Amino acid sequence: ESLVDNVLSALGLDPIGTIVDKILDLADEFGDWLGATEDTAANLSNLLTKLLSDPASVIGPLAQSMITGLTGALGNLNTAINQIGDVLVGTVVTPIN
Amino acid sequence: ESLVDNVLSALGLDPIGTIVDKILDLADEFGDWLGATEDTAANLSNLLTKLLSDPASVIGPLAQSMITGLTGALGNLNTAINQIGDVLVGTVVTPIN
Numbered sequence: 001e002s003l004v005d006n007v008l009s010a011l012g013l014d015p016i017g018t019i020v021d022k023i024l025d026l027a028d029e030f031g032d033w034l035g036a037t038e039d040t041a042a043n044l045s046n047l048l049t050k051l052l053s054d055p056a057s058v059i060g061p062l063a064q065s066m067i068t069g070l071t072g073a074l075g076n077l078n079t080a081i082n083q084i085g086d087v088l089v090g091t092v093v094t095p096i097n
Numbered sequence: 098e099s100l101v102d103n104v105l106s107a108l109g110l111d112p113i114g115t116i117v118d119k120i121l122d123l124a125d126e127f128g129d130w131l132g133a134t135e136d137t138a139a140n141l142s143n144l145l146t147k148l149l150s151d152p153a154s155v156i157g158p159l160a161q162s163m164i165t166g167l168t169g170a171l172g173n174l175n176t177a178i179n180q181i182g183d184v185l186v187g188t189v190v191t192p193i194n
Contacts, residue, residue, distance in 0.1 A: 030107040
């Protein structure tokens with residue numbers, strides 16, 4: 001009885017009733033435990049597979065600054081375009097390349 | 098014996114044999130439980146660490162449209178180049194900037 005009581009207390013349910021009822025509650029708790037474990041494993045596997053194959057749905061929008069050098073390249077191109085525009089009207093500026 | 102049988106049924110295995118055999122099967126089932134739990138935890142930790150450090154292998158290819166403003170910046174640059182090409186031969190167009 002004490003083994004059943006301590007196990008049920010550890011797993012969460014409050015044991016009230018006969019030993020048979022406590023054993024049935026313990027079996028139901030282990031069933032829920034199995035469900036939780038299997039669902040966690042399946043979710044992890046599915047998330048891994050989706051992140052490998054199609055990351056668009058799982059991953060939300062992200063800032064350009066997270067990409068390495070994207071902001072630098074965009075700034076370089078924009079400054080090159082601006083310098084191309086400016087030289088034709090004057091305002092001598094340091095060339096980029 | 099009913100506690101043993103109900104626990105075994107909850108964990109999945111069908112209890113057939115003596116009490117000793119059922120207990121041994123129960124012990125093997127908990128060993129597999131331990132393996133599953135530890136493997137799930139280790140896989141989650143490894144996935145988190147790899148996704149933090151090197152996201153290349155884990156994350157598959159993704160569409161440019163997922164990045165915020167990347168398609169807009171590329172379109173703006175391409176339209177600027179096209180306008181630069183067009184103005185020199187005519188076809189008056191609204192300047193971008």
